[PDB]
């Protein structure tokens, strides 16, 4: 992987592995999300962020701040097959005091065609109190050095899917998968649950018949609270709709505290 | 990745990913096991096995037979750090009518030093009845074309750890992790639970303080029965001692054994 000629974006190629694919021998959306995180991590390191596991700027370390994900949105047109090479381009943008955004474009390395796109919103958090905050002037200034200064969006469109408000699923859910717990392979190098695990947990309550007859086209996930290493999660799903659409809710098994909400759009194979 | 000059082994390099490492920023043993499986798949494809999900020979397809893992044994000297390049060499050998063996050697790409080694035993199974079988003459003949004909062992030593008999853990277990279930990411392209998931489940009953203060040096796992997509597993562990443990995976309900194993850990 490497920064592009202008130093304002990063590209990396990946060969899809045998264990990375599902029943149709193409990459799962979790494999795609892991690749997005990997190229994101390589881009941050290339532009001078810390290499200790928390990816921070100089001003962030001084103020004890970290980035946390608020939303992840992925749209796939074609899932790469086992053995195919996928090329992913990523870049970041400042969003004033709100937070920052990371965007991605996936391409087939052979044809050069766009096979997917993704966008993510990140918000500042004090690492000690876990309280959200605004992005300060010094952090906005740091982002000018490695982000394009004119807008560059993976999802440019007027009222596009990546910016839609997601409602809260009301009981009873049409489908559910209960007692979901993370194991050590679900944790990152800082012992926090990997953001991709939540995608897998959301998907657990989709009936197997939908997965067998449909391909996932779009997934939008809001991150509200973190699932701790000793927490237990319930994944809930209700149909809201050729195309099938679902509303999702992840909550703690005991008290029902919300951890994530999302929506998925599936198209018949 | 590619076959070596003689066409009797296969090599592939991998860059350790950010999500592939644990708290000490080095690859987990599950990441290592996934890389071993990946280079194994690439080797089978390069020597003409089927590309439909079940790596079979021509005679195997005709007889409705598949390979199934009986035992996995891994010894790690140094876990590669995040961003390091690890080179893995793999090869297979016929073991008469018993089954076949796949061996691996892991090396640091920069120093060229051996950082680990692994071996696995595979047994024939009829895909329809799920009954274990012996390896027939036609399958032994197919293996002569891509396996070294003189012995080549990752674990050559007399009476080495990879060949030890593993006892059955007796209740009560010292430690346990109950209600373990596979999710879709735990399944392979054929909708069977990935062999590496069982390693993670075994490790779930090791106390976190052992993981925080020790490095895993050796793991030997026997595979007895598969965990289905709708099954629930209990992971049990008892100290037998370096720290050494005896492990048992069993179905949550009836207590049917699925795996047994042993781990050896060194203080950091
Ligand atoms: C938390 C850091 N990560 C995860 C790898 C990002 O994707 C990201 C977020 C904000 N800003 C930048 C440059 N990178
Ligand atoms: C099931 C096939 N796999 C997993 C990819 C092997 O490692 C293997 C086993 C036996 N023989 C050969 C050539 N390869």
Inspect the interface and report whether the beta carbons of A23 and B82 lie closer than 8 Å.
no
B58 CB neighbour count, 10 Å cutoff: 13
Q: What is the CB < 6 Å shell around ligand 2?
A: B 40-41, 44, 55, 67, 92, 100, 102, 122
- A60 lies in the same domain as A135: yes
Distance between CA atoms of residues A136 and A132, nearest Å: 12
B179 and B148 in a common domain: no
User: Considering the domain boundaries, does residue A139 fall inside one?
Assistant: yes
Cβ–Cβ < 8 Å for B122, B138:
no
Residue B216 Cα to chain centre, angstroms: 15
Give A19's contacts in chain B (Cβ within 8 Å): 34, 37-38, 188, 194, 196
CA dist., res. A27 & res. A16, Å (int):
7
The preferred substitution site among B35, B92, B139, B223 for testing ligand 2, maximizing ligand atoms within 8 Å of CB, is B92
- State which residue of chain A sits closest to B188, comparing Cα positions: A19
Q: Are residues A36 and A155 in the same domain?
A: yes
Shortest CA distance from A18: residue in chain B: B38
A190 is catalytic: yes
Place of tokens 């409602």: A167
Ligand 1 atom at minimum distance from A68 CA:
1
Residues B159, B186, single domain; the answer is no
CA angle B8, B14, B16 (to 5 degrees): 150
Q: Which chain B residues are Cβ-neighbours of A211 within 8 angstroms? A: 184
Chain-chain contact of A28 with B185 (C-beta, under 8 angstroms): yes
Q: Of B103, B136, B163, which one is at a domain's C-terminal end?
A: B163
Give the CATH number, domain containing residue A210: 3.10.129.10
Find tokens 């074309």 and name the residue.
B145
Q: Breaks in chain B at C–N > 2.5 Å: after which residues?
A: 241
Whether residue B190 is found in the same domain as residue B58? no
Looking at chain A, the residues that come just before a C–N gap of over 2.5 A are 241
Domain's final residue, options B163, B197, B221: B163
Query: Are B200 and A183 spatial neighbours (Cβ–Cβ below 8 Å)?
Result: yes
Per the CB < 8 A criterion, the answer to whether B162 and B262 are in contact is no
Within chain A, residue ranges assigned H as helices are 29-46, 58-62, 137-144, 195-204, 208-213
In a domain, A169, yes or no: no
Q: Which H or E run includes B223?
A: strand B214-223
Task: Give the three-class secondary structure for B255.
Answer: coil
> Minimal CA–CA distance to B164: which of B250, B37, B71, B69?
B71
Q: Please tell me the distance between residue B128's alpha carbon and the centre of ligand 1 in angstroms.
A: 49
The residue segments making up the domain with residue B210 are: 175-267
Residues A14 and A141 reside in one and the same domain? yes
CA of B54 to the centre of ligand 2 (A): 9
CB-based contact A105:A88 (threshold 8 Å): yes
Of A21, A185, A203, the CB nearest to B200: A185
Contact A65, A127 (CB under 8 A): yes
Q: Does residue B168 fall inside a structural domain? A: no
CA distance A223 to A250: 10
State whether B31 and B56 are in the same domain.
yes
How many structural domains comprise chain A? 2
Are A246 and A263 in contact, with CB atoms under 8 Å apart?
A: yes
Q: DSSP secondary-structure letter at B167?
A: P
Is the Cβ pair A183, B180 closer than 8 Å? yes
Q: B71: closest CA among B246, B265, B259? A: B259
Tokens of B158: 């007399």
Q: Is residue A209 part of a domain?
A: yes
- Are B152 and B189 in the same domain? no
Residues A64 and A125 in one domain: yes
Q: Are residues B140 and B39 part of one domain?
A: yes
- Domain end marker among A160, A188, A219: A160
Identify whether B124 is part of a domain: yes
Nearest CA to A83 out of B108, B44, B81, B198 is that of B44
Beta-carbon contacts of B156 under 8 Å, excluding residues fewer than 6 positions away, are none
* Domain membership flag for residue A165: no
Say if residue A109 is in the same domain as residue A242.
no
| Residue A265 DSSP SS3 | strand
Q: How many CB atoms lie within 10 A of CB A155?
A: 14
* Strand A132-133 to A175-180 pairing: unpaired
Alpha helices by DSSP H, chain B: 29-46, 58-62, 137-144, 195-203, 208-213
Q: Flag whether B193 is in a domain.
A: yes
Say if A143 is an interface residue toward chain B (CB within 8 Å). Answer: no
B170 lies in a domain?
A: no
Question: Comparing C-alpha atoms, which of A135, A152, A131 is closest to residue A143?
Answer: A135
Question: Do both B157 and B181 map to the same domain?
Answer: no
d(CA A139, CA A127): 16
Residue A194 appears among annotated catalytic residues = no
């Amino acid at each position: 992987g490497s920064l592009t000629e202008d130093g304002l974006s990063y590209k990396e190629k990946f060969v899809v592995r045998s264990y990375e694919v599902g029943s149709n021998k193409t990459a799962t959306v979790e494999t795609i999300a892991n690749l997005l995180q990997e190229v994101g991590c390589n881009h941050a390191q290339s532009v001078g962020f810390s290499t200790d596991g928390f990816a921070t700027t100089t001003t962030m370390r001084k103020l004890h701040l970290i980035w946390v994900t608020a939303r992840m949105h992925i749209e796939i047109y074609k899932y790469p097959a086992w053995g195919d090479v996928v090329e992913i381009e990523t870049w970041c943008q400042s969003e004033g005091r709100i937070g920052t955004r990371r965007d991605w474009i996936l391409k087939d390395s052979v044809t050069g065609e766009v096979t997917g796109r993704a966008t993510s919103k990140w918000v500042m958090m004090n690492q000690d109190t876990r309280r959200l905050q605004k992005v300060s002037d010094d952090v906005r200034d740091e982002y000018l050095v490695f982000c394009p200064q004119e807008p560059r969006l993976a999802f440019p469109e007027e009222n596009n899917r990546s910016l839609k408000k997601i409602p809260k699923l009301e009981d009873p859910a049409q489908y559910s998968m209960i007692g979901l717990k993370p194991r050590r392979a679900d944790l990152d190098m800082n012992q926090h649950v990997n953001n991709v695990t939540y995608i897998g947990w959301v998907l657990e309550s989709i009936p197997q018949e939908i997965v067998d007859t449909h391909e996932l086209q779009v997934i939008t996930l809001d991150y509200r609270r973190e699932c701790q290493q000793d927490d237990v999660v319930d994944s809930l799903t209700t149909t809201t709709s050729n195309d099938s659409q679902f509303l999702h809710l992840l909550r703690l098994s005991g008290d029902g505290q919300e951890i994530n909400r999302g929506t998925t759009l599936w198209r018949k194979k």
